[PDB]
Design a protein around this ligand. Structure first.
Ligand SMILES: *[C@@H]1O[C@H](CO)[C@@H](O)[C@H](O)[C@H]1NC(C)=O
Ligand SMILES: *[C@@H]1O[C@H](CO)[C@@H](O)[C@H](O)[C@H]1NC(C)=O
Ligand SMILES: *[C@@H]1O[C@H](CO)[C@@H](O)[C@H](O)[C@H]1NC(C)=O
Ligand SMILES: *[C@@H]1O[C@H](CO)[C@@H](O)[C@H](O)[C@H]1NC(C)=O
Ligand SMILES: *[C@@H]1O[C@H](CO)[C@@H](O)[C@H](O)[C@H]1NC(C)=O
Ligand SMILES: *[C@@H]1O[C@H](CO)[C@@H](O)[C@H](O)[C@H]1NC(C)=O
Ligand SMILES: *[C@@H]1O[C@H](CO)[C@@H](O)[C@H](O)[C@H]1NC(C)=O
Ligand SMILES: *[C@@H]1O[C@H](CO)[C@@H](O)[C@H](O)[C@H]1NC(C)=O
Lengths: 336, 210, 225
């Protein structure tokens, strides 16, 4: 075999009768999944991976773009100078796992090293036809509803010295986040996170960062700027666009309390991640708009050199390709 | 932090020559090293990226090489348009650059000394100017003396760009004194040392005398 | 094809603020990182920061985060750099430049703006005094005489000098200005001429300092004695 690019196809368990938009997309876009697949463990084989140059990411990226553009019709879309208006009904929104598969003559190699950093050699390779079930969760700052690292926390980056590259933190223990828009301002919302789980999780990420930055102290800070999509923890819950302020999660002085409560706002006007332009959606539905999710990873940026001997990291995101990268790091397409 | 060092910092060259300059990094950078051209009053221009990939539209006489911590930019058949400063760069770290100029034979300066004008003295200040004209190489030593006392800290020098036609430089050194101080001394002298002079040349005048 | 155009020079006093603009064209604005660098006189290029125009993510080099704000207008495809608490040592040429890489970060900058000069100084606008550098028939060096004009104590740059309203250009040396401890600039302009002509020919230096609307024509001849 050998590294090669090819047209991949998706598989899932979407139900044609559900109105949920992901199920509708996958019904028309993907094929059924094999109930009993198998993977061959390769003997004495060692192959190189590079999660940062993986064409699988780009193919999934275009899939999710296609999904959102077809599912979430906005009331007004502003692209350049052309404003487009159209029907913007409220839809059912709940991501479902999607498998990415190699066609005939090709295969997908899976790195099974429990602590593979994402780039370099892997001495425990397996061959599959499809990846695992990957939920396409669009979010910034915090990676939600992903797969956890099997052993300890793992820090992933392409090059340490390039402060313009993103850092993908892969947690091993989940830190749940429960966000709600109570039934009784129709745009005010909040989330709750365990103060100890977060303070514990952050402490473990810090310890792993010292391994990569020897004689330097590690510190976290809030975002330094940008649109509201990336300066807060933004995500879509039941079709509504949530923007949750995380300044207190990464404030050193702030870390007395049991459940840290973040303030969130539902916005009808958003800056689209899938393209260039802004969109206006309809007001939020009524009732309890609740999303109990799992924080499984972090997207961090490192501040440009100061010397203070103290390295500072701030939450980031925006390029959803990295969201897909955190789940496809262990995979590569090869031609038989 | 990545320290980027370039050598030679200054280099004389002739039209038609092959020229190669070096860039050094304090840590390994693989092949992520870029080269730029920069001329006065203009924006830098990217010549080569990633050690050897020449940018579109750049003449073929430019080429790059190196790896790890040592990299070279080479110019074949150097042309007049190539006289400029050249920077290497990795990430946010630019080198201070290597600047090329045209080589020519040694040329001693013509030296002139200008007393302050009577018009300036009325304002309470006295400027004494020493002019070094059309010399090469650029290195020169100008020493001011007032009644045989060596002056330091009260003069400023300015040097022109290399003349595009004769490849020489010119230099002014301006001594600034108060009117009161100027009128307390007689002999004002500028002593010039240069590679083209067998021994230092002194130009001088006596205040008040003609 | 990619083209960047920056705003004009800025004259500021210490403590003030400045906005530098960078208009882009000829490429996909949100697909390339935009970097800001500066070059102080006699120094190398210094990194200020960058901005990813997609959502406006930013980063900064040593110290600039406290004083610099980077923003962009996606519609007009233009980037802005705002600097607060301006200090004298902020005097420099500021450049915007894009990453040649599409959707990635290489730091290879293939398109640059022309540069924006920012001068930070407590000095106030002031026109120059022009004094003659008189030739002498007795003094000869290298077989020529020399004369000139001393253009002293002005702010800001530039001052332009010509001789005989453009009729004399060969052998003219107009030196780069020097900055004095007072905060004012000074320069000289000289010309070497045949000694035998010092009685026949007229030599006039034309000095123009537009910031103060000062124009001077000074005839320079041997002083009498
Ligand atoms: C990942 O691990 C491999 C082998 O353990 C190593 O060669 C590579 O440098 C690591 N990645 C980074 C970014 O250092
Ligand atoms: C290697 O991969 C296999 C599955 O392919 C897994 O069971 C095993 O724990 C991994 N590690 C080692 C040391 O075999
Ligand atoms: C998760 O990783 C940390 C180290 O980062 C370790 O201390 C902890 O025991 C791990 N937890 C589990 C459940 O594996
Ligand atoms: C979030 O919800 C889950 C499940 O309902 C629960 O186990 C967890 O304790 C909750 N955490 C917070 C902070 O509300
Ligand atoms: C961080 O928290 C401290 C107190 O816990 C507060 O004084 C400070 O303003 C906070 N930082 C912000 C809001 O940026
Ligand atoms: C979050 O993780 C817990 C285990 O830590 C699990 O019980 C729960 O089902 C997970 N929830 C989601 C939405 O993944
Ligand atoms: C994560 O999964 C849970 C349960 O499957 C769901 O309730 C929640 O909405 C999901 N979060 C996001 C952001 O889709
Ligand atoms: C690189 O340039 C330096 C400076 O001129 C030179 O001394 C050295 O020999 C060059 N190395 C090459 C061409 O391999």
């Amino acid at each position: 075999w050998k590294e090669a690019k090819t047209t991949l196809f998706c598989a899932s368990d979407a139900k044609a009768h559900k109105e949920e938009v992901h199920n509708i997309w996958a019904t028309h876009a993907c094929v059924p999944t094999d109930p009993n697949p198998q993977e061959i463990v390769l003997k004495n084989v060692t192959e190189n991976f590079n999660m940062w140059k993986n064409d699988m990411v780009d193919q999934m990226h275009e899939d999710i773009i296609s999904l959102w553009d077809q599912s979430l019709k906005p009331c007004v879309k502003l692209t350049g100078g052309s404003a487009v208006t159209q029907a913007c009904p409220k839809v059912s929104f709940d991501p479902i796992p999607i498998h990415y598969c190699a066609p005939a003559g090709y295969a997908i190699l899976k790195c099974n090293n429990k602590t593979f950093n994402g780039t370099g050699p892997c001495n425990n390779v397996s061959t599959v036809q499809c990846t695992h079930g990957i939920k396409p969760v669009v979010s910034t700052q915090l990676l939600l509803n992903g797969s956890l690292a099997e052993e300890e926390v793992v820090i992933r980056f392409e090059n340490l010295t390039n402060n313009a590259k993103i850092i993908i933190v892969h947690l091993n223990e989940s830190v749940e986040i429960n966000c709600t828009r109570p039934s009784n301002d129709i745009r005010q919302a909040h989330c709750n996170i365990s103060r100890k789980k977060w303070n514990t999780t952050l402490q473990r990420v810090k310890e792993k960062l010292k391994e990569k930055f020897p004689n330097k102290t590690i510190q976290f800070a809030p975002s330094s700027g940008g649109d509201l999509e990336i300066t807060t923890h933004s995500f879509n819950c039941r079709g509504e666009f949530f923007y949750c302020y995380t300044s207190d999660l990464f404030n050193s002085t702030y870390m007395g309390g049991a459940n840290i409560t973040l303030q969130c706002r539902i916005k009808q006007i958003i800056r689209m991640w899938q393209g260039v332009g802004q969109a206006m959606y309809a007001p939020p539905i009524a009732g309890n708009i609740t999303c109990k999710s799992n924080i499984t990873g972090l997207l961090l940026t490192r501040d440009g050199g100061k010397k203070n001997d103290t390295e500072t990291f701030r939450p980031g995101g925006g390029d959803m390709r990295d969201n897909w990268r955190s789940e496809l790091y262990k995979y590569k397409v090869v031609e038989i | 932090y990545i320290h980027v060092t370039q050598s030679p910092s200054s280099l004389s060259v002739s039209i038609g020559d092959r020229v190669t300059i070096n860039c050094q990094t304090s840590q390994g950078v693989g092949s992520d090293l870029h080269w730029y051209q920069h001329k006065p009053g203009r924006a830098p221009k990217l010549l080569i990226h990633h050690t050897s990939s020449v940018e579109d539209g750049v003449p073929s006489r430019f080429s790059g090489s190196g790896f790890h911590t040592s990299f070279n930019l080479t110019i074949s058949d150097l042309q007049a348009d190539d006289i400029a400063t050249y920077y290497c760069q990795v990430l946010q770290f630019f080198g201070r650059g290597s600047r090329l100029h045209i080589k020519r034979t040694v040329a001693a300066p013509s030296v002139f000394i200008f007393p302050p004008s009577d018009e300036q003295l009325k304002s309470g200040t006295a400027s004494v100017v020493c002019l070094l004209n059309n010399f090469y190489p650029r290195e020169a030593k100008v020493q001011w003396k007032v009644d045989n006392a060596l002056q330091s800290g009260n003069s400023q020098e300015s040097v022109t760009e290399q003349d595009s036609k004769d490849s020489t430089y010119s230099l002014s050194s301006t001594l600034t004194l108060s009117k009161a101080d100027y009128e307390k001394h007689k002999v004002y002298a500028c002593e010039v040392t240069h590679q083209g002079l067998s021994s230092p040349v002194t130009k001088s005048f006596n205040r008040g005398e003609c | 094809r990619a083209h960047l155009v920056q705003s004009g020079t800025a004259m500021k006093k210490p403590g003030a603020s400045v906005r530098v603009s960078c208009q882009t064209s000829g490429y996909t604005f949100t697909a390339h990182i935009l970097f800001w660098f500066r070059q102080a006189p006699g120094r190398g290029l210094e990194w200020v920061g960058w901005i990813k125009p997609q959502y406006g993510a930013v980063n900064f080099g040593g110290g600039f985060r406290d004083r610099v704000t980077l923003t962009r207008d996606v519609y007009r495809e233009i980037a802005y750099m705002d600097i607060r608490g301006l200090k004298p040592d902020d005097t420099a040429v500021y450049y915007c430049a894009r990453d040649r890489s599409y959707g990635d970060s290489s730091w290879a900058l293939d398109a640059w703006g022309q540069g924006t000069t920012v001068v930070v100084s407590a000095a106030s606008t002031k026109g120059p005094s022009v004094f003659p550098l008189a030739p002498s028939s007795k003094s000869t060096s290298g077989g020529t005489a020399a004369l000139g004009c001393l253009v002293k104590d002005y702010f800001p740059e530039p001052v332009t000098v010509s001789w005989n309203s453009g009729a004399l250009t060969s052998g003219v040396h107009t030196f780069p200005a020097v900055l004095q401890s007072s905060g004012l600039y000074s320069l000289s302009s000289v010309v070497t001429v045949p000694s035998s002509s010092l009685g026949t020919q007229t030599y006039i230096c034309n000095v123009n300092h537009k910031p103060s609307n000062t124009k001077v024509d000074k005839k320079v001849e041997p002083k009498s004695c």
